[PDB]
Ligand SMILES: [Ca+2]
């Protein structure tokens with residue numbers, strides 16, 4: 001129940017979408033990583049910027065990204081009620097306990113969906129499921145404003161995300 005279609009035919013690892021070119025996602029959701037049996041959906045964060053981030057503890061680039069994602073989350077929470085959030089999608093981590101301990105050991109404060117088979121990839125309009133990490137910045141209407149198919153820094157994400165909070 002969405003319209004977003006992803007394309008990057010020039011091999012570029014970051015794509016930005018002007019306001020007029022933005023498309024809608026379905027109400028992406030799944031089981032909470034930290035609270036089994038409780039759903040998290042985009043509609044829980046209405047009017048907030050959302051930084052979706054696909055990650056696994058098994059993934060070296062995800063581990064280097066972890067600190068920057070925490071900074072991004074803290075800055076968005078303080079921006080603007082919270083201005084925005086990071087929302088992780090935990091993938092290919094087939095032991096929930098291992099993923100939870102990663103989150104706790106690294107002091108990560110943002111919520112994640114527990115999605116071992118990356119089912120949510122079907123809703124991301126053709127972003128390949130093999131690209132981990134992927135970060136997608138959603139505007140306040142939860143439309144993709146930027147897609148990063150690589151490890152990101154807090155600087156590059158907030159450059160996009162912070163102006164979106166104020167619009
Ligand atoms: Ca709910």
Ligand SMILES: [Ca+2]
Nearest residue numbers: 033034111112
């Ligand atoms: Ca969680």
